[PDB]
Amino acid sequence: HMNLCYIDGKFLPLEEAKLPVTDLIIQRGVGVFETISTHSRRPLMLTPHLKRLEGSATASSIVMPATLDEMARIIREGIKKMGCETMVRPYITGGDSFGKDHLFSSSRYFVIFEEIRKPDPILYEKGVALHPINAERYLPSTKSINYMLSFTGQRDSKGAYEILYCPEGEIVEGSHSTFFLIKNGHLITAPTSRALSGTTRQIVLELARRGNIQVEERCPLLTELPEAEEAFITGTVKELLPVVRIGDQIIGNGVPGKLTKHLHQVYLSSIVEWLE
Amino acid sequence: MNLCYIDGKFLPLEEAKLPVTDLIIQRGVGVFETISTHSRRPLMLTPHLKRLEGSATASSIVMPATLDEMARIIREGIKKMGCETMVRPYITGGDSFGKDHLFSSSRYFVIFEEIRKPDPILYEKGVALHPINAERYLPSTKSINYMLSFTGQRDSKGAYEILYCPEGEIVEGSHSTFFLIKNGHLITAPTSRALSGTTRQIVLELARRGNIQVEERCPLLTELPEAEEAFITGTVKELLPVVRIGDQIIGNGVPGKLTKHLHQVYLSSIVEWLE
Ligand SMILES: Cc1ncc(COP(=O)(O)O)c(C/N=C(\CCC(=O)O)C(=O)O)c1O
Ligand SMILES: Cc1ncc(COP(=O)(O)O)c(C/N=C(\CCC(=O)O)C(=O)O)c1O
C-alpha cells in the first residue's frame, strides 16, 4: 500500500502532508515521537510505546494534543488502511509557542505509516559495526526528534551501521537502538537511568528472566570489549541485530554468536504475547 | 505582517508549510541563522551567511541556494516588512540522506518577523541564568536543535535563559555568548567550545579599541563569587546584563559599569557592520 500520514483529522498520502513553518519542531527541534512496528499486521507493544510517547511529551513540557486512546484509535485505523507490515511513527510537536507558564500548549500531532523496511538478511548473517562517540543523549528517558548527530557523525564513521553513545568510555546505547554485551553467557546493558527504556530491551530482559540468563544493568565499558563473546543492538524494526565490531575492536571471533541467535529465535517464537 | 519566503514566493508567515517527509521534521536535520536590522539594514549579514554555509557544510547538507541569492531574498523581505526585522534563513535536510552521505535535496525558507527587543526593564535590572550540566555538540554548527533551551527550564525558577556549564565550566547561553567581568577584564569561552557569535566578534573588536583585556577561556561557576559583572550577547538582545546565575548573585546584583559602557560603544559603533 502507499505510505500515509494522519494529520488534521484525515489520512493523506504521506508525500502530500505538510506542517506549518511556525511550528517549533521545525524552528527549534521541539518534538517527540515513537516508532511502532507490526508482526502479522498487529502492532507490537502499542501501549508501552504510547505511554513512552506521553512520558517524552510531559518530560519536554509539551501538553499532549490528544489522549492516548485517541492516538491508539488513529494508529489502528492507519494500520488497517495499510493492509501490510507497517512501521508507524506518531509525532508530537511543540506547536507555535512556549507560554509564560513554561509549557507548549498548542502542540500538533501527526502519524506516519510506512511499509516496514527490515535490515537486509545479510546483516543478521554477518553482523554490523558500531562507531563509538564521546557524547550522551540528554534527558535520555525522552525520545526527541533530534537525530542530527547520528548523521553528521557519519563523516568519521568508516561505514559503521550506527553510532554508539560512549560518554567517558561507558557504553550507554545506540542512536536508534539498545546495546547488549555478552560476557560469560550473560547479558550486560546500561540501566534506564542512562538509556531509553526500549520496548525490545524490556522483552529481551523478560526472555532472559524466563531462560535463567543473568542480566547486569550497568554500562559495559569500551575497555571490557576485548573479553566479550558477543554483542547485539535492539529496536522494534531491527529486532536483535548482531554487533561484530565496535570502533577498531572486533567482538569475540567477529561473527554472530550463539546466545544472540538463541535470543533472536525465542523473540520471534514468543512475539505474539506482546501484539495488541 | 510577518513573512516566510518559500518555493520562490513571500507568503504570510502563518500560511507557509513544509512537507512532513523533510528530515528537519523527522530527525531534526536543519541549520539556521538569526540576522537583525538597525535602520532597516541587516547587521553582519555576510558573517551570518558565511556561518550558515559553515553550519550546512559541517552537517553534510548541500547548499540549496547561493549566499548571493539568500542575501537578495533577505534584503527584499526586509524592504517588504517596512520595519526593523529579525530574519531567519533555514536550511533543511530534505527528504533523504544519500549513499554519498550528503543531504542533496535540501529545502530552504526565510522567516521575517518584526523585531522583539528585550523589554527596557531587563537592561535596567539585568536577568537571571539557569546553569545546566550539558554542552552543545559540534558547537561551531548552529543547528535547529534548541530543545534543551526549553525542556531544561523545568526547575528554571523563572530564569531568562539556560547557560551550558558542562562539569562546572561556563561555555555559553542557549541563545547567547556569555561574558564574565573580573578585575576589569572580559572572560569568554574560546570558539573551540562556543559558537563564533557575531555580537561576540564585535565585542572583542570593541575590547581591542578600548584596551580592555580579553581572556578566551571558560569562566568557572566557582569564580562567580569574585566576579564584578556578567552579560550575554546576541544580534537581537545586544549586550544584556546578567545579575544572577543559579543561586549566585553577580557583584552587587545590578548591571555593572563596564557592561553599560560596552553597550553604549556597541550602539555607537555598529553602523560600521551594517550591510
Ligand atoms: C535512542 C533509542 N534507543 C533505543 C531504541 C529502541 O527502542 P525500541 O526497542 O522500543 O524500538 C530507540 C528506537 N529507535 C527507533 C526505531 C526502532 C528500531 O530501531 O527498530 C527510532 O524510532 O528511531 C531509540 O531511538
Ligand atoms: C548557541 C548560540 N550562541 C550564541 C549566539 C549569539 O550569536 P550572535 O551574536 O551571532 O547572535 C546565538 C544566537 N541565538 C539566537 C538569537 C539571539 C539574539 O539574537 O539575541 C537564536 O536564534 O537562537 C546562539 O544561538
Residue numbers in the entry:
A (entry chain A): 0 to 275
B (entry chain B): 1 to 275
Give the text the authors published on this PDB structure.
These are pyridoxal-5′-phosphate (PLP)-dependent enzymes that catalyze the stereoselective transfer of an amino group from an amino donor (amine or amino acid) to a keto compound (ketone, keto acid, or aldehyde) to form new amino and keto products. Each subunit of the dimer consisted of two α/β domains: a small domain (residues 1–114) and a large domain (residues 127–275), connected by the interdomain loop (residues 115–126).
To shed light on the substrate binding mode in AmicoTA, the structure with D-glutamate was obtained at 1.9Å resolution. In the complex D-glutamate is covalently bound with PLP via Schiff linkage. The occupancy of the adduct was found to be 0.7, the rest of the cofactor was in PMP form. The pyridine ring was tilted 15° from its position in the holoenzyme around the N1-C6 bond, and the released side chain of the catalytic lysine moved toward Y146, forming a hydrogen bond between its εNH2 group and OH group of Y146. The α-carboxylate group of D-glutamate formed a salt bridge with the guanidine group of R27* and a hydrogen bond with the hydroxyl group of T34. Neither K99* with H101* (analogs of the “carboxylate trap” in bsDAAT) nor R116 was found to participate in the substrate binding. To summarize, no canonical “carboxylate trap” was formed when D-glutamate entered the active site.
